[PDB]
Structure 1
Amino acid sequence: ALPDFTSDRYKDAYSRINAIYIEGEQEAHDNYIAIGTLLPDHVEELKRLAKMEMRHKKGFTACGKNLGVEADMDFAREFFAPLRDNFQTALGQGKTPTCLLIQALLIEAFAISAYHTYIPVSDPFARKITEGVVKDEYTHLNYGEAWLKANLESCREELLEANRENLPLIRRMLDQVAGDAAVLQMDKEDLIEDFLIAYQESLTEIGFNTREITRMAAAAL
């Protein structure tokens, strides 16, 4: 059954999960702009992507206002700190393939999983907003997949390294959100399945074979 969106129990968990949505959209915006410093000829497309992320952020901000819940932004910022630190490191070293794997692949897949899972248990206001959002993040996966597919032969090793370092962070993120997510009536196994399916499909599209992908997914352990 649907959660009681008015309960103190729900609002408490929501303050953190919703803050994660909001912060995630903000960092996605920042990341796409940042990638523009690495792909100067991609700037106008990246600006469109980043603007979409700000629309997403505004929508989740609105979802919070609607339930009367103050977002715990401090919690969210710490939650994203490991991937954010790794993204910045890559950015400073000009490592475009690592930046794309972290943002366009890992974070977008995490988003699509969270949002797909949240929809059937969301309040009616948030549901319409979130239904809009999910259609968009496939556009973002497509963007990352396209560039990486086009450049695979020069960046294969970097990508294996990027996955090795960053996929475990996604696993720890899922472990950390699981409790609050369950209060929101979201099953951890659904979140994991949806995430892994999205990621595997991106890797397939990029040109990795089944063995390579199996070895990659394994690094989560």
Structure 2
Amino acid sequence: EALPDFTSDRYKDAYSRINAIVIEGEQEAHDNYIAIGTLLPDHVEELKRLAKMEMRHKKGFTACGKNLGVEADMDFAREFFAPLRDNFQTALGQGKTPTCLLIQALLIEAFAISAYHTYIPVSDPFARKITEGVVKDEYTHLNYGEAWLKANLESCREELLEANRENLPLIRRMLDQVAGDAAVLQMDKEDLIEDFLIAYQESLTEIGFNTREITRMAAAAL
């Protein structure tokens, strides 16, 4: 729990990768909400609003890197998201709204929430304020996904179980891949996992899944 030395070569190196992941994630989130507008034309003005929030998030996190004198490793970041991005693209192409929403509005928003929650107490004063701004918006995004999936659950149960089976392991893999750099940032991987699972389980509960269903799903991470 002691704060890192934000000025060290060790810290900056780790930050170059973690910062890039966040910046790429925010851009992809923008792109994803806009793409979901093609599937839900009647939601376009709300999705545009969510997409605009993501660009604000991206600008803020970009400024966090600049503030520490770090250059973001964007190639690393693009590779990091590729497996999940490919799955989102595949679902979009097939018109699989429930899967697109599970990927972006549940899994990724829960991952971000957990990351940002865990980062705040060990963040530098500039980044801390930016990150504290963003976490409220994550709940808005989660709530948007939750509401649509809740309203449509009975037509998409099976697809959501499939989407979870395929994509939850990818979040696990991402956590495994980021954990070393996150530890340099004084973030405990066990905190990241706990917060992610709590957020995701709470979203599934809101949508209408029962305890047994959620347990069977969280297990897919296997």
> Normalised by the shorter chain, which TM-score bucket?
over 0.9
**Distance (Å, rounded) in 2 between the aligned partners of 1:26 and 1:117:** 21
Secondary structure of residue in 2 paired with 1:6: coil
List per-residue Cα deviations over 1:129-179 (Å, max 9, x = no partner).
Answer: 000001110000000000000000000000000000000000000000000
Secondary structure of residue in 1 paired with 2:221: coil
**Distance (Å, rounded) in 2 between the aligned partners of 1:8 and 1:193:** 30
**Distance (Å, rounded) in 2 between the aligned partners of 1:174 and 1:109:** 12
Secondary structure of residue in 2 paired with 1:77: helix
Q: Give percent identity, aligned residues only.
A: 100
List per-residue Cα deviations over 1:72-130 (Å, max 9, x = no partner).
Answer: 00000000001100000000000000000000000000000000000000000000000
- Give the equivalent residue in structure 1 for 2:43: 42
Moved over 2 A (4+): none
- Give the equivalent residue in structure 1 for 2:54: 53
The alpha-carbon deviation at position 207 of structure 1 amounts to: 0.1
The alpha-carbon deviation at position 39 of structure 1 amounts to: 0.1
Number of residues of Structure 1 aligned to a counterpart in Structure 2 = 221
Secondary structure of residue in 1 paired with 2:175: helix
The alpha-carbon deviation at position 190 of structure 1 amounts to: 0.2
The alpha-carbon deviation at position 197 of structure 1 amounts to: 0.2
**Distance (Å, rounded) in 1 between the aligned partners of 2:117 and 2:141:** 15
The alpha-carbon deviation at position 210 of structure 1 amounts to: 0.1
**Distance (Å, rounded) in 2 between the aligned partners of 1:102 and 1:122:** 27
- Scaled by the length of structure 2, the TM-score of the pair is 0.99
The alpha-carbon deviation at position 28 of structure 1 amounts to: 0.2
Please, which runs of 5 or more residues in structure 1 have no aligned partner?
A: none
Secondary structure of residue in 2 paired with 1:3: coil
List per-residue Cα deviations over 1:192-211 (Å, max 9, x = no partner).
Answer: 00000000000000000000
Secondary structure of residue in 1 paired with 2:39: coil
- Scaled by the length of structure 1, the TM-score of the pair is 1.00
**Distance (Å, rounded) in 1 between the aligned partners of 2:139 and 2:63:** 22
**Distance (Å, rounded) in 2 between the aligned partners of 1:196 and 1:132:** 22
- Give the equivalent residue in structure 1 for 2:111: 110
The alpha-carbon deviation at position 44 of structure 1 amounts to: 0.0
Secondary structure of residue in 2 paired with 1:4: coil
Matched, 1:181 2:187: no
**Distance (Å, rounded) in 1 between the aligned partners of 2:80 and 2:191:** 20
**Distance (Å, rounded) in 1 between the aligned partners of 2:5 and 2:136:** 27
The alpha-carbon deviation at position 47 of structure 1 amounts to: 0.1
- Give the equivalent residue in structure 2 for 1:198: 199
The alpha-carbon deviation at position 65 of structure 1 amounts to: 0.5
- Give the equivalent residue in structure 1 for 2:161: 160
The alpha-carbon deviation at position 69 of structure 1 amounts to: 0.2
**Distance (Å, rounded) in 1 between the aligned partners of 2:65 and 2:200:** 29
Aligned-residue Cα RMSD (Å) equals 0.3
List per-residue Cα deviations over 1:57-81 (Å, max 9, x = no partner).
Answer: 0000000110010000000000000
